[PDB]
Symmetry: C2
Subunit: 448 residues, 2 copies
Amino acid sequence: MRHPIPDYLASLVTELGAVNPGETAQYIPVLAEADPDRFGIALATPTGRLHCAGDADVEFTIQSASKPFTYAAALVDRGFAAVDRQVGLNPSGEAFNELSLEAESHRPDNAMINAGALAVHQLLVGPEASRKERLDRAVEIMSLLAGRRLSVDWETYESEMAVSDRNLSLAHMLRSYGVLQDSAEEIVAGYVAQCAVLVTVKDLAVMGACLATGGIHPMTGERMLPSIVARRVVSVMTSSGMYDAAGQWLADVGIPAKSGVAGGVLGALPGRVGIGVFSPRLDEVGNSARGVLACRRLSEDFRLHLMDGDSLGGTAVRFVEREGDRVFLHLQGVIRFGGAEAVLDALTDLRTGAEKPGTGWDAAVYPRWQEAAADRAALSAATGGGAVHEAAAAAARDENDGPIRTVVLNLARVDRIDDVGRRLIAEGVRRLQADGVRVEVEDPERIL
Amino acid sequence: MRHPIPDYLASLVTELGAVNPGETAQYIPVLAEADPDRFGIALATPTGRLHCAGDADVEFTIQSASKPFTYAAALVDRGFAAVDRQVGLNPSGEAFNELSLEAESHRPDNAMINAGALAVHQLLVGPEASRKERLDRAVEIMSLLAGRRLSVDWETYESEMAVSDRNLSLAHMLRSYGVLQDSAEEIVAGYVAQCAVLVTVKDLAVMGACLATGGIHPMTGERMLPSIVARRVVSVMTSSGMYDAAGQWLADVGIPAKSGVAGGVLGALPGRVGIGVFSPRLDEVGNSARGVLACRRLSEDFRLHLMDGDSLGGTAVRFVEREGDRVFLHLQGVIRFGGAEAVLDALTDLRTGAEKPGTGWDAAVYPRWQEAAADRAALSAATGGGAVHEAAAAAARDENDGPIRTVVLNLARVDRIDDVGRRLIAEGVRRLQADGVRVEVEDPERIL
């Protein structure tokens, strides 16, 4: 059987391809002359799958969509403190206002706008880094997430340098306020080479998935970035990626994205998918007309929206077996706060102490809450509490004949657990034992 | 054993309670005179749990934290088109600029700022609604999510009406541009009564959980709001809740929130938790000083951040049994796009047709991707692919002796599935059958 997603994308490529409004970036003939009759799209999943359609293998310069990756590299190289002194986190339009550096911050609003990107490139390797090392670092970071060595289209680069007065303007102003240390020319050349890196819709989809997973490359499972860094980058993409239209975009689409003037659009939805879209023509605000509409379609059709919750929750608890004197608690999935919390609930739902729980709420005041609580299993399926409810059941009628002396924690089905989950679950175990309960943690591949 | 979360909150209440900077809302003596030595916090989970600490049972007027609930009610009553004509989705500071209505929109920036809230209240029941019905509707919506009948503190209301010149200013300007139809006085009285509704930290935590779950009340499992409406509301809380500091707040905290001048702060993290915080004193920008810091602490300590992905993913697939000729595929959790997608992958990972799959990528170009793909199980645990990999295994060495004639889909462990998931999974089944494979869907409580 053939995967239905790629077909959906094919349908999408045909439908939205019925028209092709807007126009190509006019500033450089290399872009103004590029074939406008191209439209490709790719989805890279968290687990390592890649569904695509249309011109998804056609190369184009990444331009502004490079901004979150260099921002990423800079944060890893210099740390948060050093980057935050030079780059803010405030959303703004690309139009430059000097007042934005006159603030006691003395720094560009954010990493998505040009002035902010120029400051990022400057911080790329270290204070004593050479022009060549910073570019290589830019190209490297994008290449490591793309999974293949990328190249700089020097034809576009040259075309761009011949008309880089605006960026030179930004860089000079920035030097003026001490945000840039090196020459305006040097930093602009580096940022322009950076924007000339060649990628395909597929490359972007994969690169976006690395951010979407929290820094893990979906095709290898190797950590390419710290989860904290990926988080920051996706944060700024969401609040600043679409400049002054970021709010409207957050509400109608909900997909952290950033587009480039060559027709490319990058997306990254935490825990769900990396997206690459390509369509040469841009709308009135400078974004890829179809690329942007393709993202709105994916969101509405699949409910792929940042605000549409999708957590493991109680499903962290595979099941609860009250074999007899001993209780078996198996866990599964990617355990973080959500799952850890549910686990702690299952453990507490066992009578391993004088059961004098604090209902949290007054049954007298909330009769409905009591009624709903009665049908433990129904209430769980309506919210989504996996098998956590099986704990209260084990500590139910079965307690009527025999206490609980042993609890076995099986983690075989658990893929991985973050620190928060590890600390919460560990404490849970520590507190169970304190109840005179024996606790054995069966953990084949030492994950705890 | 005692639940570790409430203790963590207790620790948090004690630590941050070491100091109490800022000051109480000075505009009305009722608020300027309120005891500042109070600090409470509550967390309401998706499954129906409630962890709290400190003064979490103390009532205070909800003020601005009422804005997302009335916005919610208005969207349900009038529909999106009618509300969007009057209320925008653009982030802005509370400072009012007339230019914001001179735009061809002719509407306030968003529902989180006063002018935007006045427009929302006006739309509350319908065009022919009376003053009393709109207030009742406001009080009702907040009451249905809180789970108990709430009351308007008329003492605060009176205190406020005596100094409502600013809001009267807004309402009058809004009437000027036709955003309000009724009198400035009438709408301001309604909005002020609205802000005087009494709630506790716990009430807010529960109310926020309803939004966090997509509209489902965590204590009953009853749908209180459409998922689309809850989505919009949380979208605007994130982009506009903290006005011009929304970007910075999105990055350092990542919790959709809105605070009120009485010390209350409401939070709502999709798929994870509802939050109520209370601390009378406000900082320089008007938010609850400790309430705001409490949210930053919860985010950093538990990694409770909108951009920190937490999905079911491959865990939607409980397991894959290749008993013999027949294959058993059990699903679980809250199946949406993420889980549905993984399911479709499992199905495709079975050879039920001439296996001429499109790797998506060239093995020659990506040697590392091939290597990682080889150890199917390792790669899955590194990204988090639950049991989807068990499908390729069933279609592995076992195919070497016998094809696959029957596939059994068990949904017993699945809590619920949205439309997107239902359409994707249904198509998967439709396409399996087309391969001459028998497919039986064991679904006890008809969920499909």
